[model samples]
Target: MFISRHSGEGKFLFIDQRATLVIGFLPQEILGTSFYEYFHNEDIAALMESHKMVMQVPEKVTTQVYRFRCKDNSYIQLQSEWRAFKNPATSEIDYIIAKNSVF
Candidate 1:
């Protein structure tokens, strides 16, 4: 899987073709959207919990399974590996690198 980065507001900045295919949406459609908005409602709490923890310590890596919504409105079960980091240039912890947890 390729690496995709998110903003402080959970907006996707860059998503690779592999992810676009899995998400069934173009990067353009996915970008600028809150990552949580696509997750299954039941999974939001878990996803947000880990997201909160990781943002506190960007060096930490967290994984959680959630349902991803595809462009065609189908949902797929996926585990996501998350890593938060402060961009040296920005000096603020905003970007998160998400690895689509599908094998």
Candidate 2:
């Protein structure tokens, strides 16, 4: 199995979507805290716009690559893939997977 590990508060993310709809695991620090807590105010604003685009579009896959803070407060560049649930129902919710990659 290819298990990817990241050092951040996003470690505890379990959408528990029956199927898979909107799912993502952010850093633990940013998990409960607002996006601003994880990202800068400007980043948070940009994130909102990106989120809107994600929902507005229907590609089923959205990805954001950048350096972000970790639990240790270290910044590392990562590529996060946002995969929407094929069946977006209570039984199935979409999910976003985060993996560290360099391109």
Candidate 3:
């Protein structure tokens, strides 16, 4: 299992240790990188659709499957449940939290 936090624009902010083990990337390597950089090009459209939904509905979990590029330049199938975290003051999505597992 992997847990990660992403900015509203899908940039990696933080990821758990298990994520490093699964994705073969160090925290520093992934931090501040956009998730789209590692996502399969073919899957981007679908992922964008899901992202929009997640952003629109705060706290609603959305599940998605896609191929993510590993540190070794290989792709791995991953399924992740994403939820939007809202900022209390702004009432806008502050970040996204994802729970992931390999398929």
Candidate 4:
């Protein structure tokens, strides 16, 4: 996931081919959509906490485990590492990147 800092919305700028294989969603379908929409309700708070930590700490990795909804409406447990990138001159968030693995 690549999230825009200005919008305060987590969107998928790019998704790997393997993600399509694992989650059964096309890149076009996932891109420009909120990642939070696919998150399980119960797992959202934990993921939010991780997101907050990543945003506050910039460039540091925050690991979180949460349930992601698949295209078929099934949920899969995923462990993801979230990291924020900061603009050097402004010291503000540029974007956030997340790497996920099935757990």
lDDT of 1 by residue, 36-99 (tens): 8898888888888888877877465656667888899889888877777887896776678888
Query: What are the per-residue Cα lDDT tens digits for candidate 4 across 1-103?
Result: 4222211356777776578877778888887887788989998888777677777774656556678899999998887767777788988766677678786
Candidate 4: which stretches are off by over 4 Å?
A: 1-8
Instruction: Quote the positional error of residue 50 for candidate 1 in Å.
Output: 0.8
Q: How do the predictions measure up, each by TM-score? A: 0.86, 0.45, 0.92, 0.82
Which pairs clash in the backbone of model 3? Answer: none
Best lDDT among the predictions, by candidate number: 3
Q: Residue-wise lDDT of candidate 3 within 13-82, one digit each (tens)?
A: 9999788888899999999999989989889889888888888885556556799999999999998789
lDDT of 3: 0.87
What does candidate 1 score on TM? 0.86
lDDT of each: 0.78, 0.39, 0.87, 0.72
lDDT comparing candidate 2 with the true structure:
0.39
* Model 2 per-residue lDDT tens digits across residues 1-103: 1122221222324323221111233333233443334454335555555545544455543336555454556554444444333345553334334333433
Clashes of 1: 0
| lDDT of model 1 at position 87 | 73
Which residue runs of candidate 2 sit more than 4 Å off their true CA positions? 1-37, 40-42, 60-64, 86-94, 97-103
Q: After superposition, which runs of candidate 1 have C-alpha atoms over 4 Å from their true positions? A: 87-91
Which ranking of candidates, highest lDDT first?
Answer: 3, 1, 4, 2
